[PDB]
Amino acid sequence: TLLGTALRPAATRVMLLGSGELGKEVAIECQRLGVEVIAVDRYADAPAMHVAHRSHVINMLDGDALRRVVELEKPHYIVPEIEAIATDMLIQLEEEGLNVVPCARATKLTMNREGIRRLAAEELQLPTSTYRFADSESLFREAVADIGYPCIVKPVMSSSGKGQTFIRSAEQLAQAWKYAQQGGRAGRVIVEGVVKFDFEITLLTVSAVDGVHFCAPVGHRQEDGDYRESWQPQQMSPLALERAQEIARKVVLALGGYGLFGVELFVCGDEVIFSEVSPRPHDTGMVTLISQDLSEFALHVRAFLGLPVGGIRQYGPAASAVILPQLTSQNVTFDNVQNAVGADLQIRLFGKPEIDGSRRLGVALATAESVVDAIERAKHAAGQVKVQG
Amino acid sequence: TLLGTALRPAATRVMLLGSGELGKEVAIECQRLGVEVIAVDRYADAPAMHVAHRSHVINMLDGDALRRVVELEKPHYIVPEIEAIATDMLIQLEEEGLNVVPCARATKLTMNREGIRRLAAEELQLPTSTYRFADSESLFREAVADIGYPCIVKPVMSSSGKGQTFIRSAEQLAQAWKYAQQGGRAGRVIVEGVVKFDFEITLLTVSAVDGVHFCAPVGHRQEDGDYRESWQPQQMSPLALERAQEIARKVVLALGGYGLFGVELFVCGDEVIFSEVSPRPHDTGMVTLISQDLSEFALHVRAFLGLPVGGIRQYGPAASAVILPQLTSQNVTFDNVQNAVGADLQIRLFGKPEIDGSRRLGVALATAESVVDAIERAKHAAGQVKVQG
Numbered sequence: 001t002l003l004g005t006a007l008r009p010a011a012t013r014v015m016l017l018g019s020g021e022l023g024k025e026v027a028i029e030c031q032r033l034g035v036e037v038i039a040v041d042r043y044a045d046a047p048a049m050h051v052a053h054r055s056h057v058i059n060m061l062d063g064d065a066l067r068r069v070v071e072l073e074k075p076h077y078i079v080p081e082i083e084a085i086a087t088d089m090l091i092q093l094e095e096e097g098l099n100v101v102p103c104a105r106a107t108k109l110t111m112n113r114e115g116i117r118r119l120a121a122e123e124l125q126l127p128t129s130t131y132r133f134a135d136s137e138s139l140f141r142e143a144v145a146d147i148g149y150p151c152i153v154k155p156v157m158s159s160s161g162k163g164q165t166f167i168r169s170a171e172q173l174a175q176a177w178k179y180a181q182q183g184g185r186a187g188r189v190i191v192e193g194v195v196k197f198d199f200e201i202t203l204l205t206v207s208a209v210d211g212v213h214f215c216a217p218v219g220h221r222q223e224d225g226d227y228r229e230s231w232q233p234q235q236m237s238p239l240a241l242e243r244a245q246e247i248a249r250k251v252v253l254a255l256g257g258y259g260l261f262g263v264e265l266f267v268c269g270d271e272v273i274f275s276e277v278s279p280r281p282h283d284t285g286m287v288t289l290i291s292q293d294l295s296e297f298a299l300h301v302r303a304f305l306g307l308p309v310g311g312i313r314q315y316g317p318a319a320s321a322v323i324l325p326q327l328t329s330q331n332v333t334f335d336n337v338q339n340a341v342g343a344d345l346q347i348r349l350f351g352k353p354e355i356d357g358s359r360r361l362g363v364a365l366a367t368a369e370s371v372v373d374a375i376e377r378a379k380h381a382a383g384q385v386k387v388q389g
Numbered sequence: 390t391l392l393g394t395a396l397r398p399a400a401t402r403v404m405l406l407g408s409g410e411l412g413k414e415v416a417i418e419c420q421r422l423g424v425e426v427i428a429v430d431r432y433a434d435a436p437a438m439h440v441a442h443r444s445h446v447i448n449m450l451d452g453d454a455l456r457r458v459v460e461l462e463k464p465h466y467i468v469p470e471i472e473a474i475a476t477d478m479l480i481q482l483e484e485e486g487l488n489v490v491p492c493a494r495a496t497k498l499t500m501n502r503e504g505i506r507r508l509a510a511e512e513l514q515l516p517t518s519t520y521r522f523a524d525s526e527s528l529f530r531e532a533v534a535d536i537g538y539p540c541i542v543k544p545v546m547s548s549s550g551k552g553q554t555f556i557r558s559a560e561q562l563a564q565a566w567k568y569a570q571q572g573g574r575a576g577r578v579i580v581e582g583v584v585k586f587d588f589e590i591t592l593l594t595v596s597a598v599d600g601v602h603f604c605a606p607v608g609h610r611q612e613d614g615d616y617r618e619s620w621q622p623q624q625m626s627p628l629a630l631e632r633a634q635e636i637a638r639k640v641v642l643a644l645g646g647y648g649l650f651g652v653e654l655f656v657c658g659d660e661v662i663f664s665e666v667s668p669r670p671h672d673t674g675m676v677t678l679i680s681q682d683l684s685e686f687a688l689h690v691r692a693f694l695g696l697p698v699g700g701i702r703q704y705g706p707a708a709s710a711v712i713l714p715q716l717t718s719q720n721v722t723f724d725n726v727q728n729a730v731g732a733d734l735q736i737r738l739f740g741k742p743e744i745d746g747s748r749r750l751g752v753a754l755a756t757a758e759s760v761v762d763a764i765e766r767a768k769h770a771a772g773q774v775k776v777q778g
């Protein structure tokens with residue numbers, strides 16, 4: 001592995017497709033290695049743009065626009081932060097010699113639930129919830145009848161809970177369908193049977209030159225489409241951890257390429273069920289910004305540059321808690337910060353230029369002698385922040 | 390403490406006067422809290438500029454220049470990275486209501502050996518080496534005479550050992566007095582009595598809203614005016630430590646203002662001698678990038694922003710080892726990096742645009758079961774990096 005100096009002729013150039021808070025940490029980690037960084041998104045002054053050498057604002061879903069910026073900047077690596085990208089062009093570029101992280105195919109499979117679900121369940125034969133796809137309201141109903149109640153419906157091209165309904169009875173059928181129609185490319189939906197798990201985790205898995213590595217299990221708490229808190233490690237039986245790792249290894253290798261992946265699993269005692277996977281750093285993994293020697297972001301960077309991971313140090317019980325206000329402003333301020341940080345307590349404020357309703361503007365991080373204590377410390381701190389605008 | 394959003398009208402602005410590797414990490418820490426960063430230096434593309442919002446290239450020794458950049462950017466904080474600044478303008482500006490970190494007084498006193506030496510030895514009655522100020526070769530001559538052999542001669546406005554001579558014999562004196570002229574402003578010096586210590590430390594001391602806190606002592610190895618290796622924690626007697634803390638506290642409290650200070654001391658048995666102090670993060674402190682929950686850069690920011698520190702966690706035996714090549718190039722590359730990273734091992738590459746002689750281009754960071762093992766690990770990794778021109 002050879003790295004050049006950012007801004008010099010032999011520079012190593014990384015292009016970030018999506019410049020949110022997740023990309024922001026990847027940028028920092030690239031910059032820490034003197035890696036040249038070009039941050040791209042659909043809006044100006046996005047978080048990652050704050051710490052990049054240069055930035056561009058384009059239609060990331062536009063394959064031509066993508067090709068244009070790529071031709072213009074000639075990055076060595078293209079690093080997507082989101083699902084909503086012209087994956088078809090990524091494939092082209094990849095063939096054209098571009099390094100798409102982790103790989104263009106991983107990106108295509110995961111931008112639509114259909115690709116990923118069918119691969120895991122049908123091709124890989126991994127355990128998953130029952131599911132049915134539907135592209136019409138009527139077919140939607142047939143699916144539900146076959147799946148049974150309760151069931152959850154989701155748009156095939158969605159994230160963060162957009163257009164999702166937890167269906168308990170036929171009564172909600174109408175609304176569920178509409179709502180789901182509202183979410184996406186505005187068509188197709190997935191109808192999944194409800195898994196009743198003891199708890200859920202995100203197994204941060206790194207595929208690198210020196211193999212597949214696993215971070216300690218991350219537990220999380222969801223609240224209406226968004227993670228609210230995450231913690232590590234999440235206690236699990238030895239058998240469950242082994243099955244979890246088996247599943248994650250298979251999925252990442254199947255998706256292919258080097259990088260860190262966010263493997264979402266449901267745990268039922270000693271049993272593990274595959275949910276979905278981020279072929280990149282996971283929002284819940286932000287706890288790793290305090291709980292490990294190498295964050296999930298440092299890890300992704302390390303893996304994709306072709307460097308060996310060697311190993312990951314976990315410092316003990318930790319948690320994250322989102323700072324998720326609800327307001328409309330283009331000049332957000334954060335007061336009472338003196339009460340949100342301290343011993344074994346930190347915060348991150350993303351620099352997002354504006355908000356119009358609910359938006360994750362930062363995160364509180366804490367360590368403690370138990371996850372229970374960390375979670376409370378972290379929730380408390382996030383809550384202390386006075387968001388005004 | 391109220392923080393705005395970077396790039397927004399109510400943004401909180403930090404101006405960095407000096408954009409090297411140290412400033413680079415402070416910039417990252419400011420960015421992590423959504424603070425707006427303006428990186429200033431005397432050459433373009435300085436490391437901190439890579440991660441700043443914007444930058445300026447000026448002659449930091451020119452007060453008018455300084456005033457102009459400050460007035461232009463209207464920063465809420467002015468943070469120096471180095472001694473070589475128009476501290477007089479700093480004083481003025483502070484008087485005008487600018488916030489100079491830690492305080493303008495602290496900057497002035499430390500940029501001149503004469504101020505700090507006299508303050509510590511005389512004002513605070515602390516243990517230091519034997520010293521004397523010459524202001525004529527003749528006086529230089531008389532002074533070396535009063536101090537004896539061997540002795541150290543230093544410009545009173547010198548760093549990185551610039552313009553210093555280690556004198557064991559009279560013969561050197563022609564040379565010695567001239568060199569004390571090579572470096573500095575280009576004509577006053579200090580003559581210090583050589584201290585025969587067991588080891589040298591840097592006591593990273595944070596002065597914040599919740600008072601003064603200390604990092605575990607950092608030992609280090611200097612060679613040719615440059616630190617080579619640093620490690621933590623340096624083994625010391627409880628008595629020794631206590632005395633070191635005592636000295637650090639009096640000094641930081643005496644200079645004033647919030648921030649991280651690098652207190653250089655010498656240890657002989659249970660005795661501690663004050664050498665000097667940096668009113669900002671110290672190079673040797675780079676080990677804190679792997680050794681603590683909060684790096685010296687995060688500490689500096691936490692403190693200057695008026696937030697509480699609470700506590701500092703140390704993660705066991707840790708070390709830093711510089712990447713200090715010597716060649717002339719404007720397009721440096723780094724090969725064999727895969728052999729410089731691994732478990733408990735990381736490296737940083739600063740992004741410096743060029744080199745022409747000996748220059749610090751990166752640092753290796755390691756953790757181990759023992760300080761000794763950590764040092765080997767760090768040294769070995771720095772040595773594996775092949776620096777090409």
Ligand SMILES: Nc1ncnc2c1ncn2[C@@H]1O[C@H](COP(=O)(O)OP(=O)(O)NP(=O)(O)O)[C@@H](O)[C@H]1O
Binds near residue numbers: 193196222225
């Ligand atoms: N079949 C299922 N059974 C039980 N709970 C489920 C099921 N599918 C989803 N959930 C729950 O709903 C949450 C969100 O589901 P998910 O499939 O990840 O939506 P998403 O829109 O893809 N969100 P994101 O993680 O941001 O990509 C999960 O994390 C679980 O808490």
Ligand SMILES: Nc1ncnc2c1ncn2[C@@H]1O[C@H](COP(=O)(O)OP(=O)(O)NP(=O)(O)O)[C@@H](O)[C@H]1O
Binds near residue numbers: 585614
């Ligand atoms: N009186 C002394 N006795 C013994 N060693 C000394 C003495 N003064 C300096 N040294 C050694 O010389 C090194 C550099 O001295 P120093 O006074 O810190 O110079 P400088 O130019 O100000 N360097 P810097 O640390 O970058 O500001 C110290 O770190 C010690 O290892």
Ligand SMILES: [Cl-]
Binds near residue numbers: 131132133
């Ligand atoms: Cl189906």
Ligand SMILES: [Mg+2]
Binds near residue numbers: 159160276
């Ligand atoms: Mg998803």
Ligand SMILES: [Mg+2]
Binds near residue numbers: 160227283
């Ligand atoms: Mg999510």
Ligand SMILES: [Mg+2]
Binds near residue numbers: 264
């Ligand atoms: Mg999910």
Ligand SMILES: [Mg+2]
Binds near residue numbers: 547548549665
């Ligand atoms: Mg000095």
Ligand SMILES: [Mg+2]
Binds near residue numbers: 653665
């Ligand atoms: Mg010194």
Ligand code: NA
Binds near residue numbers: 049
């Ligand atoms: Na920048």
Ligand code: NA
Binds near residue numbers: 099100
């Ligand atoms: Na790839």
